[PDB]
Amino acid sequence: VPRGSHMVMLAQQWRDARPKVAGLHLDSGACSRQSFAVIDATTAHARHEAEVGGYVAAEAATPALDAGRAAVASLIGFAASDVVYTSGSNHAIDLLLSSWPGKRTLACLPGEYGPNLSAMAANGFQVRALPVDDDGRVLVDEASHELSAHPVALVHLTALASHRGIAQPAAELVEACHNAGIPVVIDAAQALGHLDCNVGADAVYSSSRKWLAGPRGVGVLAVRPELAERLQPRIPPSDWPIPMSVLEKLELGEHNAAARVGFSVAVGEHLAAGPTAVRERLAEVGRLSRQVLAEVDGWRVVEPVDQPTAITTLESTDGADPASVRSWLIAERGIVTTACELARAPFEMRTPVLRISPHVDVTVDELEQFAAALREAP
Amino acid sequence: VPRGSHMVMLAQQWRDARPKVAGLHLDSGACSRQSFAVIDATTAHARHEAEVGGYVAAEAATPALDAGRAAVASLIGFAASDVVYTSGSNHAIDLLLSSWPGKRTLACLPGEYGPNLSAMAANGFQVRALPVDDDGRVLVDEASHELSAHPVALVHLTALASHRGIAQPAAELVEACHNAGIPVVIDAAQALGHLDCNVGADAVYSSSRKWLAGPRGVGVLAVRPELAERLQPRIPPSDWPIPMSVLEKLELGEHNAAARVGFSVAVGEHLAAGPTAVRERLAEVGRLSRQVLAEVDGWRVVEPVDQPTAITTLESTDGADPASVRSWLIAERGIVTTACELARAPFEMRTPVLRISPHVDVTVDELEQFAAALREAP
Ligand SMILES: *Cc1c(COP(=O)(O)O)cnc(C)c1O
Ligand SMILES: *Cc1c(COP(=O)(O)O)cnc(C)c1O
């Protein structure tokens, strides 16, 4: 017996702070939609660069930039001074792993994001898999045993995977890993702004452009000071003249400053709307999605029906190619989606999937238009 | 006997395509000023990301992105398909040097940009100095002898230094290096849009935000195919599943797409205005600057008076600190400048300098206001 949507003003306020969608956007897990305020804040900084000078404009923006660090810090339980800006989540993990001291061994999910594995390998890490259930959810007790008996230099948990909408039990794993005396890094690229990311991790990173609906080309890396000062940044070399802290070294480099102030506005908007309220809505968006897609011929829903996420993935039962379906949906029906290849999670995925990832604004009629379009798809 | 300025409509068209400066901007070598068109083009893409989807918007922008590659390619004598987007010039040299095969030995100017040296070191290069005159200009014949007798895996020429406005004889050095059978990389961060960068180099890189007046957070790297396919990118590892070309690997990663289309508009504007005409104007801006600053007490001009560049640097003769002067000029008189520390060119600079780097729009009255303000400076 299905249930109605809990009506909340939040959904509409969100939709109306953003430009009108052309068709139908179900792809906030890939790239969400900047508010007018975010777009204006970015444009404004670029204009200011042109008036007063680019570096003086950047200096004058330290208030807003610091605000953004702090808002991020509050969402993860770190201090604002532990937080640093990056180009994105891949930049973030590379900065971290390339800086890591001593024995480079880690454990992670089998469903680990492929480009993360790529970076792990490129930085000379030995990578072991953590024990999981049939869905890819970590088994926390078994993981505890495994890590006590067989130690590793760090654990890398993707709290929410790009290819499947399973909420990982982050907090429970973090205390298990700490009991074994092992630090935890968290890939919160999908999770930040979506799951409770206040779980006592040692490092966390994420991306601007996804659930926080900020500009592309920005991410964040946060590292606790105990860990931060053990790190040995690749650039500059460790025997270099100009003395600066580890986090100052990691944040070093040319970047789009405007996009960073854009981001700060965007986290601001998340906090303003209420983290907890937004997350409960996204969880409900997921419920409704899986109810509506429960019965489509040629597609089965992969996630349990009451996982607290907005990510819902569909596997074809008659050998249809999601990349093609995605293309059709865009060109013909203006419906934006993501096709996840095996390369996204090579040691878990056996077959590609179609991923919907709608934000708070989605309606039940919109989920029906998708299901309709999904039926009459070549 | 001084000479008048060659009046050209170019100066004014440029000024009027940009926002009104608040005070006086003499710092295009650090960060220039985006045109209204550039700013609008960037904003437009971000808005489009929000309507049609971020990745579909990026795909739809391939025309403009490819245009920008091509415009860059024409300025350096490469093919558009040799050109790739980066975060900036430091990103560029790191991508290149981290990818370099076999024996890692190079020669460069003693006046090499400090962060370049830092990257060279971090990638395990042995770095030798090329012979130069008193100004830091390379002596081409002596360099030819040195390289024949004592070979090196590549030569890194900064065609125009950040700390001093010496135009390096790039073309003449490139043929000398090729005669010795040695490839040449060029740091054209200051030179692109400023000097003739069509000189037959094997690789060239530059930055969006300087003389081409594009967005921050963007640069370009161009590599000839002979060299490109010998390169072995750090990420992904060389034994990785997904097969793609070297340049495709280097351009991989999250980035601000909007800023890239911004950049394309900006190179467009340079080509539209006429490279050769713009360069001759910048050269004249330099002449006028050095005439006007010829006699200031407590400051001497460093560059010969007829170097074809807009970069003019001042050394204090009564132990004044340029960082302080720069700060005063901004806070009190709204004049934007750059203070170059020793760390910018550690193996050449003995003492800090104040750097002016005005674009085509500068007037002679503006250069007088600076000289005036430079006299009554604490
Ligand atoms: C989006 C994604 C990333 C990649 O981050 P970039 O911002 O593209 O560098 C990382 N991990 C997850 C789980 C992803 O969904
Ligand atoms: C500006 C500058 C750079 C640094 O490039 P980024 O865009 O800041 O990464 C490189 N070399 C020269 C000569 C510089 O002036």
- For A115-126, b/e burial (b = at least 16 CB within 10 A) is bbbbbbbbbebe
Residue A118 to residue B34, Cβ atoms within 8 A: no
Q: Is the peptide bond before A243 cis (omega within 30 degrees of 0)?
A: no
Q: For A325, which DSSP code?
A: H
Say yes or no: do domains B9-30+274-375 and B37-273 share a fold: no
Evaluate whether the domain defined by B37-273 bears CATH number 3.40.640.10. Answer: yes
The C-alpha atoms of residue A202 and residue A252 are separated, in whole angstroms, by 21
Distances (CA, A) of A147 to A129, A271, A324: 11, 36, 42
Return the H-helix or E-strand segment holding A107.
strand A105-108
DSSP line for A331-378:
HHH-EE-EEE-GGGSTTT-SS-EEEEB--TT--HHHHHHHHHHHHT--
- For A312-330, b/e burial (b = at least 16 CB within 10 A) is bbbbbeeebebeebbeebb
All structural domains of chain A with their residue ranges: 9-35+274-375, 37-273
Residue A53 to residue B27, Cβ atoms within 8 A: yes
Spell out which residues of chain B touch residue A254, defining contact as CB-CB under 8 Å: 87-91, 207, 209, 216-217, 219
Residue ranges lining ligand 1, Cβ < 6 Å: A 88-90, 113, 158, 161-162, 187, 189-190, 207, 219; B 254
Where residue B219 falls (left for φ over 0; alpha for ψ -120 to 50; beta otherwise) is beta
Residue ranges lining ligand 2, Cβ < 6 Å: A 254; B 88-90, 113, 158, 161-162, 187, 189-190, 207, 219
Residue A234, chain B, CB below 8 Å: the answer is: yes
The C-alpha atoms of residue A236 and residue A98 are separated, in whole angstroms, by 12
Topology of the domain comprising B9-30+274-375: Aspartate Aminotransferase, domain 1 (3.90.1150)
Q: Which residues contact B50 (CB under 8 A, 6 or more apart)?
A: A18, A19, A21, A33, A34, A39
In angstroms, what is the span from residue A356 Cα to ligand 1's centroid? 16
Nearest atom, ligand 1, residue A208 CA:
7
Nearest atom, ligand 2, residue A253 CA:
9
Residue type for B46, please?
Answer: A
Experimental method, per PDB record: X-ray
Q: What is the dihedral of CA A242, A246, A251, A254, to 10 degrees?
A: 30
The C-alpha atoms of residue A289 and residue A337 are separated, in whole angstroms, by 14
Which ligand approaches the C-alpha of residue B256 most closely? 1
Nearest atom, ligand 2, residue B209 CA:
7
Give phi and psi for B201, each to the nearest 5: -75, 165
CATH class of the region A9-35+274-375: alpha beta
Which ligand approaches the C-alpha of residue B168 most closely? 2
The C-alpha atoms of residue A22 and residue B51 are separated, in whole angstroms, by 5
Q: For A24, which DSSP code?
A: E
